[PDB]
Ligand binder design. Structure first.
Ligand SMILES: */C(=C\C(=O)Nc1cc2c(Nc3ccc(Oc4ccn5ncnc5c4)c(C)c3)c(C#N)cnc2cc1OCC)CN(C)C
Length: 276
């Protein structure tokens, strides 16, 4: 099997139009791809990496590309091509609605119960595929989920597939530096919390150094107002200190698909918030 096609791109058929974001791993540009000597223009995102660890990170980036060049899950962004300059550039289809975090932030009061439960199902499906292909994301978050259409999301970034945001990290990853698929389930729980809070900041105001002591003392993210205890209880399972107490991604797929089939039973939007 595995007949995927990597389209090695010449840099001259790529136009960087606008910076969309940057971080530790590279800069993402909104841009236009014009196949070599072809008549089409495709809206693309281009992430140009750095020059550091050109000896070692290129190879780990190469295999990230191998795993995400296959047409695998519709809920994982697929790599269109690689630009093999001195600084490796990755070209990919542009999801026009942007990253989920700021999508849900500016559509508060515009999203119902099924839209929120449908995403959590898809995001769990996308992570379930990554678990089947032996990839640990390490940085699952609302900011790292894309909106293709109002009811279709994709997991992306993978620059980490020290520098991990500590508020999405499992406790065993903070203390023992250990990353498993079950630590990604913890990240899944936080991401769902972000959705159900319409893009609230986890542990807002709490410094990152205090987080591990906070978690070791038994505190977790609070119950979102629109969550029933059914939904909140799934997140709580994802934050068990024992990694084998947390749900499996194939279980999270079934439970959120069950709740998406009856969204009124499990998410109550009428409760956006209340003023004190
Ligand atoms: C939200 C800022 C924001 O809206 N950004 C975007 C992002 C868009 C992306 N994102 C993207 C992520 C990671 C990339 O690097 C890859 C490395 C390896 N891979 N294997 C498979 N796929 C990859 C990607 C790249 C190149 C891009 C994509 C994609 N893919 C498409 N369209 C995007 C649009 C966009 O905004 C446009 C409105 C931040 N707030 C501040 C929280």
């Amino acid at each position: 099997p595995n007949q995927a096609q990597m389209r090695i791109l010449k840099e001259t058929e790529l136009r960087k139009v606008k910076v969309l974001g940057s971080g530790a791993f590279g800069t993402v540009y909104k841009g236009i791809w014009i196949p070599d000597g072809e008549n089409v223009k495709i809206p693309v995102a281009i992430k140009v990496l750095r020059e550091n660890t050109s000896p070692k990170a290129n190879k780990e980036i190469l295999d990230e590309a191998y795993v995400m060049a296959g047409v695998g899950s519709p809920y994982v962004s697929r790599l269109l091509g690689i630009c093999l300059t001195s600084t490796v550039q990755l070209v990919t289809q542009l999801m026009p609605y942007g990253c989920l975090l700021d999508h849900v932030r500016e559509n508060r009061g515009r999203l119902g119960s099924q839209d929120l439960l449908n995403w959590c199902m898809q995001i769990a499906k996308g992570m379930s595929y990554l678990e089947d292909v032996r990839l640990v994301h390490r940085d699952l978050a609302a900011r790292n989920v894309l909106v293709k259409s109002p009811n279709h999301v994709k997991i992306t970034d993978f620059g980490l597939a020290g520098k991990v945001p500590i508020k999405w990290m499992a406790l065993e990853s903070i203390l023992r530096r250990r990353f498993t698929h079950q630590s990604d389930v913890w990240s899944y729980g936080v991401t769902v919390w972000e959705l159900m809070t319409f893009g609230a900041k986890p542990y807002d105001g709490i410094p990152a150094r205090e987080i591990p002591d906070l978690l070791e003392k038994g505190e977790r993210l609070p119950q979102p107002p629109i969550c029933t205890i059914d939904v909140y209880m799934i997140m709580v399972k994802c934050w068990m200190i024992d990694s084998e107490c947390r749900p499996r991604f194939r279980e999270l797929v079934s439970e959120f698909s069950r709740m998406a089939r009856d969204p009124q039973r499990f998410v109550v939007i009428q409760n956006e918030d209340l003023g004190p």
